[PDB]
Design a protein around this nucleic acid. Structure first.
Ligand code: MG
Ligand code: MG
Ligand code: MG
Ligand code: MG
Ligand code: MG
Ligand code: MG
Ligand code: MG
Ligand code: MG
Ligand code: MG
Ligand code: MG
Ligand code: MG
Ligand code: MG
Ligand code: MG
Ligand code: MG
Ligand code: MG
Ligand code: MG
Ligand code: MG
Ligand code: MG
Ligand code: MG
Ligand code: MG
Ligand code: MG
Ligand code: MG
Ligand code: MG
Ligand code: MG
Ligand code: MG
Ligand code: MG
Ligand code: MG
Ligand code: MG
Ligand code: MG
Ligand code: MG
Ligand code: MG
Ligand code: MG
Ligand code: MG
Ligand code: MG
Ligand code: MG
Ligand code: MG
Ligand code: MG
Ligand code: MG
Ligand code: MG
Ligand code: MG
Ligand code: MG
Ligand code: MG
Ligand code: MG
Ligand code: MG
Ligand code: MG
Ligand code: MG
Ligand code: MG
Ligand code: MG
Ligand code: MG
Ligand code: MG
Ligand code: MG
Ligand code: MG
Ligand code: MG
Ligand code: MG
Ligand code: MG
Ligand code: MG
Ligand code: MG
Ligand code: MG
Ligand code: MG
Ligand code: MG
Ligand code: MG
Ligand code: MG
Ligand code: MG
Ligand code: MG
Ligand code: MG
Ligand code: MG
Ligand code: MG
Ligand code: MG
Ligand code: MG
Ligand code: MG
Ligand code: MG
Ligand code: MG
Ligand code: MG
Ligand code: MG
Ligand code: MG
Ligand code: MG
Ligand code: MG
Ligand code: MG
Ligand code: MG
Ligand code: MG
Ligand code: MG
Ligand code: MG
Ligand code: MG
Ligand code: MG
Ligand code: MG
Ligand code: MG
Ligand code: MG
Ligand code: MG
Ligand code: MG
Ligand code: MG
Ligand code: MG
Ligand code: MG
Ligand code: MG
Ligand code: MG
Ligand code: MG
Ligand code: MG
Ligand code: MG
Ligand code: MG
Ligand code: MG
Ligand code: MG
Ligand code: MG
Ligand code: MG
Ligand code: MG
Ligand code: MG
Ligand code: MG
Ligand code: MG
Ligand code: MG
Ligand code: MG
Ligand code: MG
Ligand code: MG
Ligand code: MG
Ligand code: MG
Ligand code: MG
Ligand code: MG
Ligand code: MG
Ligand code: MG
Ligand code: MG
Ligand code: MG
Ligand code: MG
Ligand code: MG
Ligand code: MG
Ligand code: MG
Ligand code: MG
Ligand code: MG
Ligand code: MG
Ligand code: MG
Ligand code: MG
Ligand code: MG
Ligand code: MG
Ligand code: MG
Ligand code: MG
Ligand code: MG
Ligand code: MG
Ligand code: MG
Ligand code: MG
Ligand code: MG
Ligand code: MG
Ligand code: MG
Ligand code: MG
Ligand code: MG
Ligand code: MG
Ligand code: MG
Ligand code: MG
Ligand code: MG
Ligand code: MG
Ligand code: MG
Ligand code: MG
Ligand code: MG
Ligand code: MG
Ligand code: MG
Ligand code: MG
Ligand code: MG
Ligand code: MG
Ligand code: MG
Ligand code: MG
Ligand code: MG
Ligand code: MG
Ligand code: MG
Ligand code: MG
Ligand code: MG
Ligand code: MG
Ligand code: MG
Ligand code: MG
Ligand code: MG
Ligand code: MG
Ligand code: MG
Ligand code: MG
Ligand code: MG
Ligand code: MG
Ligand code: MG
Ligand code: MG
Ligand code: MG
Ligand code: ZN
Lengths: 204, 122, 14, 118, 131, 59
RNA sequence: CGUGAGGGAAAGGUGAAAAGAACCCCGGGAGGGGAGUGAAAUAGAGCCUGAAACCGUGGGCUUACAAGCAGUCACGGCCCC
RNA sequence: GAAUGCCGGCAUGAGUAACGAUAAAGAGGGUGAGAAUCCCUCUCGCCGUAAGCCCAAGGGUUCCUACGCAAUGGUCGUCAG
RNA sequence: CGAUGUCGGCUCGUCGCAUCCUGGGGCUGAAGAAGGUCCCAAGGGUUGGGCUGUUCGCCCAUUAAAGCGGCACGCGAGCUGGGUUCAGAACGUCGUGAGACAGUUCGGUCUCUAUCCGCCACGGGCGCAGGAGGCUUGAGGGGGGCUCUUCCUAGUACGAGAGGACCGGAAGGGACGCACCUCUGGUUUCCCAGCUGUCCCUCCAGGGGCAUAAGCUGGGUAGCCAUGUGCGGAAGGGAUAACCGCUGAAAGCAUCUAAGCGGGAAGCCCGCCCCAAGAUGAGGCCUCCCACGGCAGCCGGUAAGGACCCGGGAAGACCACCCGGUGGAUGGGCCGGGGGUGUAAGCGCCGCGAGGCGUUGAGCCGACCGGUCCCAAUCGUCCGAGGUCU
C-alpha cells in the first residue's frame, strides 16, 4: 500500500491516442514523513505524512515540538496512510507511474440542507392534476398502527455533502514530477483547492 | 435520444415516410435509442403502393438524430431530424436506397450495407 | 357567546 | 446553495437594489460621509469606488457612463472637478467603512459610516 | 500556488498554434482525420461556423452544413490533433456571436444576412503577399 | 393538514428545561485606548469618537 | 348585543380622624428611596382581612449510564432541630 | 373532584404562528429625555376612467389650533381620525 | 357509534417465502440445445404502453424475469378524489302516491401553525481524576449486492439431420448507485447587445425610469446541474445449504456417519465504501504546560492552550466547521489574464435620407485565475493545570 496527500487543482482534458481524456489535476507532493506508526509502539502500521508549509508564527508549541521530533519544517496538514512504510523521509508523486490505478478520497461538495429529491432522488409529487403543496415532498414515511414508528435509517431531508467520499479505480494518466502534478482520469470529490488522498487501488 | 412516441422520418425508399417509435430494442428497459440502435415502430404515414403501409409494425435502425452524438475524439455530430431505415429481423434494409447522411456509428455496429448505400457517412 | 361557528362536516363513513 | 456567488441581495428585487445603490452613491458623493447599515455600507464601497475611478479617467465617455448611475450633471461635475483630482495617485480604495457602537432603537440594526478618504 | 497556471501548464503540451483564426459567419473547410476500420483517412467538412465558445485550450467551434437534404452540425475542438488543417473559404459578417437563427432561414435569407466581409477579405488577400 | 395540537400540558419542569438555552451573553466589551471607557471592539468609540488612534466623529 | 320586538351584565369596604404623605434625592413621566402623619403604612388611595391556582428571588438536600401512575417499604449519606 | 356543569382567576401550547395585499425605498437637516416610524429637503418607486376631484346616502365634531402620550394605533411615536 | 376516514391511483418503502428471474443441485419418458418435476436459496432484480375509476383482467411491444402475499386489504394530521358515500337533474324499472333501486346517467366544499414518542439532520452541557494541541485503533453499525448480448474455445462434444454445448477466455450493453463539470447540454433577476411605446435629463447627440416580482428579444462566465464525464457491483479468504463423496463399523456384505476427512450456492462470516471511544467497557500514540499565592475542599494570579470580537469561506437555517486578522493577500477596491458581449462614445468621410464606412474586435464587462497594503480585519478582553485514595 502507498499513498500521498494532495490538493485538487481542477479539470481539463488531454489527447491520448486520438481520444479525448477528461482528467482531474492533483498537486500531490511533496509529503514529509512526520511520524511512523509501528506495531511496537502503536499496534498498527502507517506513516503520518505532512503537506503544505506553514508560517512558523502560526504553529503553536505542542505542534512545534512534534515537527521538531522529526526535523521537519512546520506543515499545515497531517494525515496517515495505513500499511504504507516508505524508505525515505519524503513522499513524492514519483511513487505513481502512468497506467496505475488509484483510489482518491476528498471532502464532497457541501449541499447544505438538501431536500429529499436532491438528496435521495425521490420522485416528488405531481406538478398538476390537483397536487396540493407536495411537489417536492417525500410522501408517506410509514405504515399505520403496526409498527407505529418510523424505521431507523429512513431516507429524509437533511444535510447532504461535505462528507468523506472515495472514488475507486481511477486510472493514472500522467505524472509531472517537476511540478509535483498528478493527472487522474475521471472525477474526484470536492472543490478545487480541497484536500485529497491518493492511495493505491484496492481493486484488482 | 429516441423514445416511445417519438416520430422519425423514414430514410429509405420502403414507402414509409413517418414512423412512431413504440419500443427501444436494447435490453430490459433502455430509455433511449440513438444512432445504431434498433427500435420497434408503427408506420404512421406511407406513400401508396409501398412495400410497407400505415399500420405495419416494423423494425428500424436509427441513422441520424436531433440530439448530438459524442465521440471518443471529443467531437460531436447532430442532425436536423431523427431518421431511421427499416430493417428485417436479420438487420438488413428492407428497402433499396438510403436518402441523406448517416452516422458513422452505424459502421462498427454492423450496418455496413446501410453505410454503403448512404450518399455520405458523416 | 356571540357567533356560533358551525363545525366541519364529518368524513362520510357509510 | 450559494457557492462562489458575489452580490448581496438586501431583500430587494433587481431594480430596487440598483436604485438603492444609486441613491446611496448620490448621497455619499454629495455629503462626503453618510451613515447607513453595515451590510449596505459594505456593498456601496465597490459601487462608489468604480465611479470615482471613472472620474479619474476624465474622458467624455466616462462622464456619460457615470451619469447613467448619478444622472446629476452638477454632482458629476463636482465628482470630476473636486473629488477625482484628490485621488490621482491613489490606486483604488477611495472609500472606507467603520462600524458604529450603537444600534437603532426600533429594529436593533447595526450601523456604520461610509466616507470618501483623504 | 497558481491553480489556473498549472492547468495552463498541463494543457500547453497539446495547444495547437498553426490554425487560421476565424469568426462566426465565416465559411470554413475542416480537414478532419477519421478512421474507417482499420484504415484512417481525411474527410473534409465545409460549412458556416455558426458558433465558437472560448475556454482557452478547451475552445470548440460548431460548423453547419446542409448535406443531401439534411442540416448537419459538427463540433470540433480547436486544438484536437484530429484536425489536419482548416481553410477559410469565405469571410462573412455576423452582427452577433452566435448564429443559431440561421437554422430556420431559407438559402437566400442566409445569403442576405451574412454578406461577404469585404474588410477581412481584403486582409486575406492583403497577406499572402509575402517573401 | 388536520390541525395538530398539544396532547398534554407541559410541566413546569419540561417548560423551563426547554429554556435552559435562553440566557443572554453579556455584551463583548473592551476599553478604549484614548478615554478608557468600555465599549465593543471594532467600532468607533461613542464616548470620544476615536478609532485606530484618531478622531473620527463628533460626540 | 340586536333592524326590531327583545336580551342584558360586571362593579361595595383606607383610617378613630385625611392627619390623603410639605420638603429633599433618582426619573421625561410612571414608579420608588428618604422625610413626615398614624396605635398600625406588606391600613398609601392598584388601600380591611388577603386563601388557592399561577410567576419569582434566596437557602438546604439532590440529579447529567438513567426505564417512570411518580408512590410506598428498607437501609445508607448530607442538612436542620 | 368530576355533571363537554356555572362565574371568576391564572396556567400550557410559546417567546412559537402572526403583525392584514411583493407599489419600495435611501440619505441629509431639525425637534425631543427618547426617533427606521414626527417635521423639512434631495433622490427613488406607486396610482392617474384613479389609489385624483365633486355630489347623494350614511356617520355625527371625526374639522382648525394649542398643550399632551397612560390607554387606543397590530412595532415605535415627539405623530394621530 | 362524547367518530378507529372508507376504493383505486401517487409517493415512500419494509418484511415474509409457498421463488418470477439470476446462483447451486437430485430425478427425467435428460443425445445436444431446450424443457418437465422436486430440492436448497429472500442477495439483488422484477419494463413501457392501449381499455376501464377501477382492484382484477384482456391486449400491444419488449424482457433474464415481467413472482405471489403481510404491514388497519401498509401509507388521506403525506397528496389525489376518477369510484364509492348527502342535498340537484334525467333514463329504465317498481310504487295510486309521496317516493324507491349492489340499476344506469351528468354534477357535486378533502381542515395554514406538531406538544410527547418515532424519524432525518445540527448544536449546547457535562463526563471520560492534571490540564492542553494534534494524529489515530475499531468494539459496534450502516451502505453495497442485479443482469443481458456478442465473440473465441467450436460449427468441435452430441446428433440421421436440423440444431448445438459444458469447462475456460475476451469484448460490449440496460437499469441502479456515488462523485464530478474537462466535453456535450441546461440555467445564469442586470454580464453584453438589439427593439417598441412613453415620461424625463438637455434642444440635438447621448442616456435614465416604467412597461413583472428581468418591458421584450438575441446571447451568456462562475456556480448549481443531466441529457454529459469518471467510477462501483467485485476479486479473493473462510464457514455452510441442497446435493455429491473418501475412509468406515454397528450388521463377515453393504452404508457420506455412528469415530474421522473431502467437495459444494447470486445466499452466510470477512473482505470493499461510510459513520463510529457517550465503546460511561468513555481506548491508543506524538507533542506542550506543570510544584502559583492564601486560608480529593474553596478563593485568587498565571502556564501550555482556549474562547470572545473582527475580515471571510464551493462550510452553513441559527449553531457548528474551515481559513485569515497589519511579521497580514481574508473580504472590498485597483491592475493583469480569462470569459461574455460582438466593433462604445466622439470625430471624419459618403448618401436628400433611413443609414453606411473607417478610427475598432472597439467599448462595456458579476462570480473565474492571479497580482497589489489603496480600504477595511483598530485596539484589546476574558477564561484557563498546581494533579484524590489503595
Ligand atoms: Mg481529507
Ligand atoms: Mg443525490
Ligand atoms: Mg435525480
Ligand atoms: Mg416531477
Ligand atoms: Mg384540492
Ligand atoms: Mg398539503
Ligand atoms: Mg401547487
Ligand atoms: Mg424535495
Ligand atoms: Mg390509515
Ligand atoms: Mg411499536
Ligand atoms: Mg457537513
Ligand atoms: Mg389503414
Ligand atoms: Mg389512417
Ligand atoms: Mg431524406
Ligand atoms: Mg436558491
Ligand atoms: Mg468571495
Ligand atoms: Mg426581511
Ligand atoms: Mg422593473
Ligand atoms: Mg466596478
Ligand atoms: Mg469597524
Ligand atoms: Mg455591535
Ligand atoms: Mg389533511
Ligand atoms: Mg391544505
Ligand atoms: Mg394548523
Ligand atoms: Mg414539551
Ligand atoms: Mg406552569
Ligand atoms: Mg421553577
Ligand atoms: Mg415542577
Ligand atoms: Mg419540554
Ligand atoms: Mg425555546
Ligand atoms: Mg435559562
Ligand atoms: Mg347594533
Ligand atoms: Mg342599537
Ligand atoms: Mg351587579
Ligand atoms: Mg371605612
Ligand atoms: Mg371610610
Ligand atoms: Mg379605633
Ligand atoms: Mg372622609
Ligand atoms: Mg430633576
Ligand atoms: Mg412622585
Ligand atoms: Mg427609588
Ligand atoms: Mg414616596
Ligand atoms: Mg395598641
Ligand atoms: Mg399585614
Ligand atoms: Mg392592615
Ligand atoms: Mg376596618
Ligand atoms: Mg392588601
Ligand atoms: Mg396584594
Ligand atoms: Mg429555587
Ligand atoms: Mg452501560
Ligand atoms: Mg451518576
Ligand atoms: Mg432491606
Ligand atoms: Mg364523585
Ligand atoms: Mg369543575
Ligand atoms: Mg372559566
Ligand atoms: Mg400563556
Ligand atoms: Mg389561554
Ligand atoms: Mg426563537
Ligand atoms: Mg411550536
Ligand atoms: Mg417556526
Ligand atoms: Mg397566526
Ligand atoms: Mg416569523
Ligand atoms: Mg397576514
Ligand atoms: Mg401593513
Ligand atoms: Mg406586510
Ligand atoms: Mg413596478
Ligand atoms: Mg440615498
Ligand atoms: Mg432621516
Ligand atoms: Mg421615529
Ligand atoms: Mg422615539
Ligand atoms: Mg416628513
Ligand atoms: Mg389618461
Ligand atoms: Mg347629511
Ligand atoms: Mg361610528
Ligand atoms: Mg386632522
Ligand atoms: Mg403638537
Ligand atoms: Mg400613546
Ligand atoms: Mg407609547
Ligand atoms: Mg413615553
Ligand atoms: Mg394623563
Ligand atoms: Mg395600542
Ligand atoms: Mg404602541
Ligand atoms: Mg391592527
Ligand atoms: Mg423608535
Ligand atoms: Mg413632547
Ligand atoms: Mg363507530
Ligand atoms: Mg372527545
Ligand atoms: Mg375520544
Ligand atoms: Mg372526535
Ligand atoms: Mg410489498
Ligand atoms: Mg424453500
Ligand atoms: Mg434456480
Ligand atoms: Mg438449475
Ligand atoms: Mg433441474
Ligand atoms: Mg430429447
Ligand atoms: Mg441441458
Ligand atoms: Mg431473493
Ligand atoms: Mg420482496
Ligand atoms: Mg405492466
Ligand atoms: Mg389514446
Ligand atoms: Mg392506463
Ligand atoms: Mg386496468
Ligand atoms: Mg374488471
Ligand atoms: Mg432463462
Ligand atoms: Mg387502506
Ligand atoms: Mg398494497
Ligand atoms: Mg390508505
Ligand atoms: Mg384528505
Ligand atoms: Mg385514498
Ligand atoms: Mg393517517
Ligand atoms: Mg388524521
Ligand atoms: Mg366524485
Ligand atoms: Mg370533481
Ligand atoms: Mg345533512
Ligand atoms: Mg318509466
Ligand atoms: Mg306508474
Ligand atoms: Mg342514464
Ligand atoms: Mg357522478
Ligand atoms: Mg361543471
Ligand atoms: Mg346523485
Ligand atoms: Mg376552490
Ligand atoms: Mg384548521
Ligand atoms: Mg417537537
Ligand atoms: Mg409519548
Ligand atoms: Mg456533543
Ligand atoms: Mg481519550
Ligand atoms: Mg466491525
Ligand atoms: Mg451501542
Ligand atoms: Mg463455430
Ligand atoms: Mg456426425
Ligand atoms: Mg463462460
Ligand atoms: Mg466551467
Ligand atoms: Mg457547462
Ligand atoms: Mg454549453
Ligand atoms: Mg454552455
Ligand atoms: Mg454558466
Ligand atoms: Mg448593468
Ligand atoms: Mg433595463
Ligand atoms: Mg426609453
Ligand atoms: Mg433624442
Ligand atoms: Mg417615472
Ligand atoms: Mg407608473
Ligand atoms: Mg406578460
Ligand atoms: Mg436572457
Ligand atoms: Mg442559453
Ligand atoms: Mg465467495
Ligand atoms: Mg458410491
Ligand atoms: Mg463405500
Ligand atoms: Mg462423523
Ligand atoms: Mg466440508
Ligand atoms: Mg469450502
Ligand atoms: Mg455477482
Ligand atoms: Mg474516521
Ligand atoms: Mg476516533
Ligand atoms: Mg454497552
Ligand atoms: Mg473518549
Ligand atoms: Mg457567515
Ligand atoms: Mg483563529
Ligand atoms: Mg489582534
Ligand atoms: Mg486580499
Ligand atoms: Mg484582491
Ligand atoms: Mg477584471
Ligand atoms: Mg480577454
Ligand atoms: Mg475575448
Ligand atoms: Mg463602425
Ligand atoms: Mg464608434
Ligand atoms: Mg456615431
Ligand atoms: Mg452631408
Ligand atoms: Mg473582449
Ligand atoms: Mg477584463
Ligand atoms: Mg507585497
Ligand atoms: Mg482595548
Ligand atoms: Zn474613547
Amino acid at each position: 500500500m502507498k499513498g500521498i496527500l494532495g490538493v485538487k487543482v481542477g479539470m481539463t482534458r488531454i489527447f491520448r491516442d486520438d481520444r479525448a481524456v477528461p482528467v482531474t489535476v492533483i498537486l500531490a507532493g511533496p509529503c514529509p514523513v512526520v511520524q511512523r506508526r509501528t506495531p511496537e509502539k502503536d499496534g498498527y502500521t502507517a506513516v503520518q505524512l505532512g503537506f503544505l508549509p506553514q508560517n512558523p508564527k502560526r504553529v503553536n508549541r505542542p505542534l512545534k515540538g512534534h515537527f521538531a521530533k522529526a526535523g521537519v519544517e512546520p506543515v499545515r496538514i497531517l494525515r496517515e496512510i495505513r500499511d504504507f512504510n516508505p524508505e525515505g523521509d519524503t513522499v513524492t508523486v514519483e511513487i505513481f507511474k502512468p497506467g496505475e490505478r488509484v483510489d482518491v478520497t476528498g471532502t464532497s461538495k457541501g449541499r447544505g440542507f438538501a431536500g429529499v429529491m436532491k438528496r435521495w432522488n425521490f420522485a416528488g409529487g405531481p406538478d398538476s392534476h390537483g397536487a396540493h403543496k407536495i411537489h417536492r415532498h417525500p410522501g408517506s414515511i410509514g405504515n399505520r398502527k403496526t409498527p407505529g414508528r418510523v424505521y431507523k435509517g429512513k431516507k429524509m431531508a437533511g444535510h447532504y455533502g461535505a462528507e468523506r467520499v472515495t472514488v475507486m479505480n481511477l486510472e493514472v494518466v500522467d505524472v509531472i514530477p517537476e511540478e509535483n502534478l498528478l493527472l487522474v482520469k475521471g472525477a474526484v470529490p470536492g472543490p478545487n483547492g480541497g484536500l485529497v488522498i491518493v492511495r493505491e487501488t484496492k481493486k484488482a | 435520444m429516441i423514445q416511445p412516441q417519438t416520430y422519425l422520418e423514414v430514410a429509405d425508399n420502403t414507402g414509409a415516410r413517418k414512423i412512431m417509435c413504440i419500443r427501444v430494442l436494447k435490453g430490459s428497459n433502455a430509455k433511449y435509442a440513438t444512432v445504431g440502435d434498433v427500435i420497434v415502430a408503427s408506420v404512421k404515414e406511407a406513400i401508396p403502393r409501398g412495400a410497407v403501409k400505415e399500420g405495419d409494425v416494423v423494425k428500424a435502425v436509427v441513422v441520424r438524430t436531433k440530439k448530438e452524438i459524442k465521440r471518443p475524439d471529443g467531437s460531436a455530430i447532430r442532425f436536423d431530424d431523427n431518421a431511421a431505415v427499416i430493417i428485417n429481423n436479420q438487420l438488413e434494409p428492407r428497402g433499396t436506397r438510403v436518402f441523406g447522411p448517416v452516422a458513422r456509428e452505424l459502421r462498427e455496429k454492423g450496418f455496413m450495407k446501410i453505410v454503403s448505400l448512404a450518399p455520405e457517412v458523416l | 357567546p356571540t357567533y356560533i361557528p358551525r363545525p366541519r362536516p364529518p368524513h362520510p363513513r357509510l | 446553495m450559494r457557492h462562489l456567488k458575489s452580490g448581496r441581495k438586501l431583500n430587494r428585487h433587481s431594480s430596487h437594489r440598483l436604485a438603492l445603490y444609486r441613491n446611496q452613491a448620490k448621497s455619499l458623493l454629495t455629503h462626503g460621509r453618510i451613515t447607513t447599515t453595515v451590510p449596505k455600507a459594505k456593498e456601496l464601497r465597490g459601487f462608489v469606488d468604480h465611479l470615482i475611478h471613472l472620474a479619474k479617467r476624465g474622458d467624455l465617455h466616462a462622464r456619460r457612463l457615470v451619469l447613467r448611475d448619478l444622472q446629476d450633471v452638477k454632482l458629476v461635475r463636482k465628482l470630476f472637478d473636486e473629488i477625482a483630482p484628490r485621488y490621482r495617485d491613489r490606486q483604488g480604495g477611495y472609500t472606507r467603512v467603520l462600524k458604529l457602537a450603537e444600534r437603532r432603537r426600533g429594529d436593533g440594526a447595526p450601523l456604520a459610516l461610509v466616507e470618501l478618504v483623504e | 500556488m497558481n491553480r489556473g497556471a498549472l492547468i495552463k501548464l498541463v494543457e500547453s503540451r497539446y495547444v495547437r498554434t498553426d490554425l487560421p483564426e476565424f469568426r462566426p459567419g465565416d465559411t470554413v473547410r475542416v480537414s478532419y482525420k477519421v478512421k474507417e476500420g482499420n484504415r484512417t483517412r481525411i474527410q473534409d467538412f465545409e460549412g458556416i461556423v455558426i458558433r465558437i465558445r472560448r475556454n482557452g485550450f478547451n475552445t470548440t467551434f460548431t460548423v453547419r452544413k446542409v448535406s443531401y437534404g439534411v442540416g448537419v452540425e459538427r463540433i470540433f475542438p480547436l486544438h484536437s490533433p484530429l484536425i489536419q488543417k482548416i481553410d477559410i473559404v469565405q469571410r462573412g459578417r455576423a452582427r452577433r456571436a452566435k448564429l443559431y437563427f440561421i437554422r430556420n432561414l431559407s438559402d437566400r435569407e442566409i445569403r442576405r444576412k451574412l454578406r461577404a466581409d469585404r474588410k477581412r477579405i481584403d486582409q486575406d488577400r492583403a497577406a499572402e503577399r509575402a517573401a | 393538514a388536520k390541525h395538530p395540537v398539544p396532547k398534554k400540558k407541559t410541566s413546569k419542569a419540561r417548560r423551563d428545561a426547554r429554556r435552559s438555552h435562553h440566557a443572554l451573553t453579556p455584551p463583548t466589551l473592551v476599553p478604549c485606548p484614548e478615554c478608557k471607557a468600555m465599549k465593543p471592539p471594532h467600532t468607533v468609540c461613542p464616548e470620544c469618537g476615536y478609532y485606530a488612534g484618531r478622531k473620527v466623529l463628533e460626540v
